Amino acid sequence: VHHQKLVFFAEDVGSNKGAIIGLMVGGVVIA
Amino acid sequence: VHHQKLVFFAEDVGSNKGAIIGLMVGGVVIA
Amino acid sequence: VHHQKLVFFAEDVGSNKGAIIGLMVGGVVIA
Amino acid sequence: VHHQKLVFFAEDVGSNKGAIIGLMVGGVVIA
Amino acid sequence: VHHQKLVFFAEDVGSNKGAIIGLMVGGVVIA
Amino acid sequence: VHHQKLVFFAEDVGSNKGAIIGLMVGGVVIA
């Protein structure tokens, strides 16, 4: 298979106080 | 298969205090 | 198969205090 | 006059992604 | 006058991704 | 006048990714 640009932003992000995950597959994120 | 640009923003994001996930497949996100 | 731009915003997002998921397939998101 | 415990929680708060205000008297909150 | 414990939590707060304000009297909060 | 303990937590705060303000009277907070 092929994955690409799963998340994409074309313009500026101010902040990320949380989670940004291209491809969450297991385990535990807490943001 | 082929995946691409699953999430896309063309303009600026101010903030993300939560979760942004291209392709959640298992495990646990808490944002 | 082919997926693309599953979620798309063409203009600016102010905030995301919740979940934005291109393709949720299993597991647990809590935003 | 006397004010006290205007807002009160006795048990655990999970999250506050919004506004919690004891006493709003003017100005502008955006949560 | 007298103010006290305007906001009160007795048990644990998990997170505050927003605003918690004892006494908003003017100006601008954006959380 | 007299102010006291305007915001109060009795138990542990996990995180503050936003604003916690005893007494907002003017100006601009962005959290």
Residue numbers in the entry:
A (entry chain D), B (entry chain B), C (entry chain F), D (entry chain E), E (entry chain A), F (entry chain C): 12 to 42
Paper text:
pmcAmyotrophic lateral sclerosis/parkinsonism-dementia complex (ALS/PDC or lytico-bodig) is a fatal disease found in the Chamorro population of Guam (1–4), some families on the Kii peninsula of Japan, and the Auyu and Jakai people of New Guinea. Abundant filamentous amyloid inclusions that are made of all six brain tau isoforms are characteristic of ALS/PDC. We now show that tau filaments from Guam and Kii ALS/PDC adopt the CTE fold in brain and spinal cord. The greater heterogeneity of amyloid filaments, when compared to CTE and SSPE, probably reflects the fact that ALS/PDC is a multiple proteinopathy based on neuropathology, as suggested for cases from the Kii peninsula.
